[PDB]
Amino acid sequence: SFVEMVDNLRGKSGQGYYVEMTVGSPPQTLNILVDTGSSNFAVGAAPHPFLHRYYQRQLSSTYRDLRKGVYVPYTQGKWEGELGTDLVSIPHGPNVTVRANIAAITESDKFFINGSNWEGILGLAYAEIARPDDSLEPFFDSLVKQTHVPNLFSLQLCGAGGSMIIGGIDHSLYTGSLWYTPIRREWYYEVIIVRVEINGQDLKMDCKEYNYDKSIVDSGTTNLRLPKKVFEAAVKSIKAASSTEKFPDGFWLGEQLVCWQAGTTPWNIFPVISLYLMGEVTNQSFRITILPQQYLRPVEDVATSQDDCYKFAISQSSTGTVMGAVIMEGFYVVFDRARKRIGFAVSACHVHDEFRTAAVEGPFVTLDMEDCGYN
């Protein structure tokens, strides 16, 4: 039933994954970015150097002005707009139409990306973090109220777009079993990390430090963003492992890239990172393991030649752990809102060399996990 939805996302992790949508009457087609780390549905409503097309309320016989302004700040980028509702559909998604809140973006700064090909954002998180306030029902909440679509969706993001299955799970998109971790509070998709390992060696820190502030799953972020103390520990460990070679310190900052002769990338000298997530049962957890093929993001050669260049896709943050696209790529992620939990399984479009492989493994024991959440 979900075949029609398989393969409905385009783009990369560097600029985000988008799905096609239409708004207004007659329908206007726009590419909307899929963001599980916000809760506001917004589209460009005015010309802009980086936009190809945009929403034109003046041409929709179904547009309703809510006469309220709105503003949304992200970790990077922000926009001002005016609220209002209209009919929305997803072509390669469930065959339904819903009336949902839409912010018409009129002002923005560092939000749209030059030639990203998406002109809007779809916040798939909960109302609590919606702007102006939790009274502005987010798109998915509308979708679930107005139709019979199950309160559940899943993402499969692929590297070098992917698929977003609305309303269910598509068993052909993953191998192995699904492992679920509880959603701690329904605002972000907040999860609890209970242990971290680099090449099998535990980072040995207070697990509280891993969730310092919070840990969220956000398809709208590229990198794997870690808290100050954790980022330091991780980078020190990854350096040691790959000390067999040298890179600029601007590299460990994600600033300057690193290149190698085509097909000679020393994958083996880079460690695998394991994140242990809290489980569904007392004292049990599972772990997902990501390969260096995931946290080293491919970019185009600075001198535009025939080399393989990469950027370090692990940066630090002050807002807690963020599991961005580089982490979600290897995996098939189920956002089971109905049962307040998030599932992981090895993706079908999985990275891998002929030696190591991304994995989801369990069960594990972890004593006193509930003492990992920060308060």
Ligand SMILES: CCCCNC(=O)[C@H](C)C[C@H](O)[C@H](CC(C)C)NC(=O)[C@H](CCSC)NC(=O)[C@H](CC(C)C)NC(C)=O
């Ligand atoms: C208003 C309450 C919700 C606020 N939520 C957020 O800000 C969540 C955590 C982050 C959002 O998902 C937001 C979406 C962008 C389209 C603006 N992403 C971001 O703010 C991050 C910040 C990384 S630190 C330089 N930006 C990114 O990940 C960008 C753009 C993506 C479209 C690929 N990519 C890179 C490589 O910098």
